[PDB]
Amino acid sequence: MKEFYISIETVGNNIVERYIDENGKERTREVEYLPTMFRHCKEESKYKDIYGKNCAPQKFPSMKDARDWMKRMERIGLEALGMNDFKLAYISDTYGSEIVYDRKFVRVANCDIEVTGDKFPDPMKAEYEIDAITHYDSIDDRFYVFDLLNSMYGSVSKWDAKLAAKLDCEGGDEVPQEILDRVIYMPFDNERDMLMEYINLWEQKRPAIFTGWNIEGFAVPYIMNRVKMILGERSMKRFSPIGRVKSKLIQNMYGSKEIYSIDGVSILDYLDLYKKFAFTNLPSFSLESVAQHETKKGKLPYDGPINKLRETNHQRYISYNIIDVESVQAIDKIRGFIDLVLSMSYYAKMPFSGVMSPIKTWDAIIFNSLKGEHKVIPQQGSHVKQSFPGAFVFEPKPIARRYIMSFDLTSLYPSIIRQVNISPETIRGEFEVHPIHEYIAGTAPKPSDEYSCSPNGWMYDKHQEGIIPKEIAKVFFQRKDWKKKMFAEEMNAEAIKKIIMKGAGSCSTKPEVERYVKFSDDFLNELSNYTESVLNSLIEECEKAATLANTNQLNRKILINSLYGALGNIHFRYYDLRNATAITIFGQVGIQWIARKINEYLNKVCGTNDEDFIAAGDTDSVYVCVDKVIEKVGLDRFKEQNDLVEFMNQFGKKKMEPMIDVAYRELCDYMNNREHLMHMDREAISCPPLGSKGVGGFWKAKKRYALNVYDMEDKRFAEPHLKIMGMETQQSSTPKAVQEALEESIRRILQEGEESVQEYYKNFEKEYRQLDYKVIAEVKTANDIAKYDDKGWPGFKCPFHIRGVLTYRRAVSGLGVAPILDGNKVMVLPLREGNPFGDKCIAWPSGTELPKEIRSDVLSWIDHSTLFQKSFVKPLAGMCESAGMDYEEKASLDFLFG
Amino acid sequence: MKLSKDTTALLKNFATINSGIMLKSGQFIMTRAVNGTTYAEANISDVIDFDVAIYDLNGFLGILSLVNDDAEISQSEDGNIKIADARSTIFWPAADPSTVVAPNKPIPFPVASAVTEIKAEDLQQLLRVSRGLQIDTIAITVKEGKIVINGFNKVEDSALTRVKYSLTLGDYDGENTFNFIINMANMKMQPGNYKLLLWAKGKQGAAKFEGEHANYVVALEADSTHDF
Amino acid sequence: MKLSKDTTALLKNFATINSGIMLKSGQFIMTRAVNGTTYAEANISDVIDFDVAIYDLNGFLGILSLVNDDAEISQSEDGNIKIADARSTIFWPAADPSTVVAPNKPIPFPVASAVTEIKAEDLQQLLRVSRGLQIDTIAITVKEGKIVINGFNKVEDSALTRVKYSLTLGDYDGENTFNFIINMANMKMQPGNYKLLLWAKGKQGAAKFEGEHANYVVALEADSTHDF
Amino acid sequence: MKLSKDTTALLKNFATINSGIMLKSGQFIMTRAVNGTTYAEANISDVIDFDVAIYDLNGFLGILSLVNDDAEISQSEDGNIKIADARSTIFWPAADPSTVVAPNKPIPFPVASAVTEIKAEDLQQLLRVSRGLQIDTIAITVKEGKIVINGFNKVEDSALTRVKYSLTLGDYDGENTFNFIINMANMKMQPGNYKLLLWAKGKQGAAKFEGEHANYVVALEADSTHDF
DNA sequence: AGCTATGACCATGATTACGAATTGC
DNA sequence: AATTAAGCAATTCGTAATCATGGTCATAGCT
């Protein structure tokens, strides 16, 4: 096991690097690094710049010397190249080659502090004392739980594992016993010994990576503020490995955000991680809600103020803290995120925190690639942020389209980058720009035939590959290689499973298996002769290999999808506004071009004229309407729905797809792009059930559509499944019960027809009155209530949910319940006529419940009608009226006047 | 043509139901609404001699009230509408038949399933008070052997149960029982005595408020039930 | 019940004071400002036999004015209010007595420092001019031995030193001096001849307007001065 | 000094065109458009003793109407306007004459190229149709030897080629021909019988309406045609 | 005493801007 | 000391201001 870095920091003119050895022990060292940059030189040198101009190396004895040199160099306004951040240069020089890592050499720490008080524990105040602490260590896979017995806010008894393992009906806490099997209890009667023990455990068991649920929000700040106020400055300093803990208070407009960085340890939050890589937004962002969403695990429900729970049950208090840390670890295990960031950083050879910014990692990887080809990285130049035009979006006709075919480009932006061969160095010049509508109709002449052009009006170097396209090809090749490895391992696992279920052998010696390769049939026959234990060991090894391959491929996917956001940014090193504008403009041109071509071809085949068959779409995705083709052929010939589905599948795969491909070949011919790459694929098939008076699909506006999909990609669905997008169903704002009933209504309109919609509307009308008050509420989000907070009453231009928040704060100020702050989703409810609170809406933290003194008052004045019509009736009416349906049979004089 | 003030008021009501109109030669006027739930017909004292369609009747009636009644109205030389006064002349564009919703033909209302009479005062009270209490919908049904009406508020009572307004209508000697529900929005007849002819079959009936100056026809709601 | 149209007018003028009102049995009607600076009482010739509290007074008096005057009022079988005329019965909902600000008992207030009489038309004129000139406040005072009222605006003349309007009640019989400042948002009295009664002790003070039907009490402002 | 009811009405009419006004001593009242497109003047029977610039004239007439016509207007102690009544006193500030837009001297009207008369009913009906037909342009011309007025919507009909409205004023026995375009906003005259005079010199053109109380002068559009 | 016409008032609706919130490529 | 860090296009509701539109009680008028 080769040595690989764990953390890197700069102190003075020295780099402190903590890392792992050959046998797997975490140790640190200091290196007085020697910075080695490059400057422009007229004499020919091996290391040339981006454009080919020569660069002469320059060495300094210290980082400060190089920084001062750069200062006096920029003072004379002369260009000097190299890598500014000496940490990246040092870490690249130290390793250079690839890095192989193991998860048992990295210490992941999941901490959580539970503190009671009369008022919400403010990290700025740090007034109360931390009477419960949990710290899970990954390498020890051990929870360390420390409980304060005596406190000014209450004295409690000692916690028990057995009692915490008992059922609630038996007075227990239902904590899993396998957890307490990995739990070490250090109770303390006094806070002083508590703090000292935590500090020395931190110092002896120094975590390589620290993460937690909104850790930097409260966990880190409150602890550091408490130790600072109780033991001066040495307290916090000694927490850091090298006595370097720095305050980074981000005083926003609304409040303050104290940020503490422990230098030498990669302090990385986990709430931001779920808010960055998960791509799914929940009605709540509490730990309990996300835990219920990921691990289906529900903590024993509690009713009352959190602080008052300790005074009634300390056992359940500690149990809740333990289970919440356990849930954090569990959701990470099922999601696989910390390993993801670690893999990304090791692949790109940058400090762990560099995962937080795609600019950073792309800069590092490009630096590494250019160092591999012996080139010189240019310095960063100042710029000004400018909003270039974005992605063109169609305007669908809000008419329910029965038959829709979807088509899409795969990874549009990287394909554009590589196809057009664009890069900050490949710039050659600008051409006479023609009006865009000329290009969309293929009427404007060729801007140039010697350089690859872009309809933003530029020509860039031909023949020569661009560095960014080079790296795009590299990452694409690695991605497809990793996916083929994944497929091979999947086939191996399936073959071993079928062998085992057919029958196992009696060989108890585990043989050697090459990773990331497909097993041969002879190999499978050999493996069929082994014992069950060996087979299971091979299965788990294959599963772990598959997980690593999935991590690699998903990291590559994140990199490629993030490169587009990386390229357009002032702080980016290879930033070039013209390049990004070229990319987006070319995307718009291509999508509108193919839109016109599709309309032309569909008019040709269907025989009509000037018909807009292209339903809608945006960048890399166009949905067209093809019901006219079905009418041309006829619905009677299909005995079953699947017959229609397979017919339209064949029609999509064999009839127009070559036309799209040849249209894009003609496109790449018209342009001077290096290579045609815009592969278009059929995406999904939308059609109503045969014979049913359903509608099949509809839209409401741009980026708003509901399509009953029968076969997305090629994965044929036995029953059709709905792919609703943009509508109120996906929105978190809609209440959960309203969300589900609305989704059922949408399914009914898509599949059955109007009458089912009306019947279910009546059923929901008669049920909605008798529903739980928890599942009918808009959730929205409170941001800067202080901006609209004015003496317990709404201010000017006061947003609705903020008004409800103010009403709730009026209601429960002095009641000592959990208060509402920014970020916390606040479910709101409307109040009718004369409410005791004094306003029409009241808002409580999402997921939470109202304490019983106000529960009766709220349930006595819940305005069922207004909410029912402003959350469920109104969007339903919008959808149905966009689909030629009415939810309530109204009728007319058609019996007679007709 | 000369349109007497009573004809102007009747046209104003027919504008309230529908902002546009079409008319043919004669003395019989028929106007529908876009939603199709309302119909109206009448026989004005004056006579129309030329067919024409008007898009914005409100301004039309306003300007005709501005000018003398004797001032003649006719179709202009360009196909539009011209009105000549003793000293002035006005021109109004002609609405096309397609651009204004118009009723197809006179409606053959079948034999009435039930019949009653409402006096002007009671109808005026109902129309004036349904806004005060947000009485969205009305029901006409058989209570204690007499036909009566009662107001139900739909916005809060989808079940149609909470009795807020209730007015006695009159006797009804019939073994049949019915529960006709009508949207207040379609209740747009001009204040006056009316004879209710209510018909129903299958799932769609109608109500004919007939009066000396015009007859109005209102659709019934699906909630309306009947047993014969 | 059978409330005269004068009773309805009194109720309507009471609605502008407080959104809702209680109704105790008898001949006595009173209500008070939500902020408590204004209070109104009156004796009604019509007889009240049962108590009920209602929040939406304006709509209720409106619908009552809508119905025929012969109608009768009682409490519903569901705890609401029901009003029935010759042919129609209506059910106006009743309210939870908690919501309404219910004054517990009328203020007898026997003694006072100053007394005068203001005519109806002068009150009307000063109310109209206060509306026109945005006169937010007035002050009843004595100058040249004359009971007078002077109007000013706080939002512009914060010190209230520049007079924007003046009216003389008359001469002052006594020799005591005072200057009572009264916000104009309090003035809700029915337009009629009133007898003005001024009292003030230390910090607190009171201005009363007595009419043939109703009497009004308002509290002076914190800058009101008095020495007797 | 006192203002009679007719004077109040006339100044009310005059406020319709200009926000402010100058009140000069004597029996002459003057006003000019804020953009100077229209002019008006009148003679009263009340002797004026002082000049004062008035900015919020609509409020001034509103407050004047609320009091009796025998109220006296005087120069207040603080360089403003005082209204003294039998029992009420009002202080309305006087605006700065520099900021108030008004002519510095009366403008005599030269000889008229065209002479005719317009009845009060004609003015009323043309203003009403201008409101109803949302006209913006009026072309006064001579057709068949008759001085007439036609209405054209310049925004919709830039060529004024569609006579939506027309009205004949008089019989003109002259080879002189003209066609003058005027915007409606210039027309602010009070209803009444008037005499119309037209006077143009090449590009320059203007019209004048004379009545028994007040007179108006209106600017014309430069696109007007004329051969005299 | 009652229909007729006018009139500001007050309600209300329609518009339009703006900000806050949230997806989706 | 590191510069501190995806991009844009799109949709919907509430508020607010603001005007316009329209009943309506209020007011002047003739039968």
Short mmCIF file of C-alpha atoms in Angstrom, two decimals, chain A residues 754-759 761-762 765 885-895, chain B residues 35 37 154 181 183 186 201-205 219-224:
data_model
loop_
_atom_site.label_atom_id
_atom_site.label_comp_id
_atom_site.label_asym_id
_atom_site.label_seq_id
_atom_site.Cartn_x
_atom_site.Cartn_y
_atom_site.Cartn_z
CA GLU A 754 -62.60 13.21 -17.70
CA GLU A 755 -65.21 11.22 -15.77
CA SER A 756 -62.63 9.55 -13.54
CA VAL A 757 -61.13 12.98 -12.88
CA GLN A 758 -64.49 14.33 -11.75
CA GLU A 759 -65.27 11.30 -9.60
CA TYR A 761 -62.33 15.17 -7.44
CA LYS A 762 -65.60 14.58 -5.60
CA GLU A 765 -63.60 16.95 -1.79
CA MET A 885 -61.18 18.77 -19.39
CA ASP A 886 -63.46 20.10 -16.67
CA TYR A 887 -63.22 18.72 -13.15
CA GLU A 888 -66.86 19.55 -12.32
CA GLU A 889 -69.61 18.63 -14.77
CA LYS A 890 -71.27 21.94 -15.64
CA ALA A 891 -73.34 21.17 -18.77
CA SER A 892 -75.46 23.61 -20.78
CA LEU A 893 -78.59 23.89 -22.92
CA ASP A 894 -77.15 21.46 -25.48
CA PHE A 895 -80.23 19.29 -24.88
CA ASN B 35 -70.68 29.03 -21.69
CA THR B 37 -75.73 27.61 -19.82
CA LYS B 154 -71.09 26.00 -2.67
CA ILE B 181 -79.79 23.39 -8.16
CA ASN B 183 -75.77 28.73 -10.24
CA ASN B 186 -76.74 32.34 -14.58
CA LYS B 201 -84.88 14.03 -18.27
CA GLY B 202 -81.88 11.75 -18.08
CA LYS B 203 -79.10 13.95 -16.72
CA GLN B 204 -79.82 17.43 -18.13
CA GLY B 205 -82.92 19.57 -17.71
CA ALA B 219 -79.27 25.14 -17.42
CA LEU B 220 -79.46 22.88 -14.37
CA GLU B 221 -76.55 21.43 -12.43
CA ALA B 222 -75.73 17.74 -12.28
CA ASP B 223 -76.39 17.78 -8.51
CA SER B 224 -80.05 18.46 -9.46
#
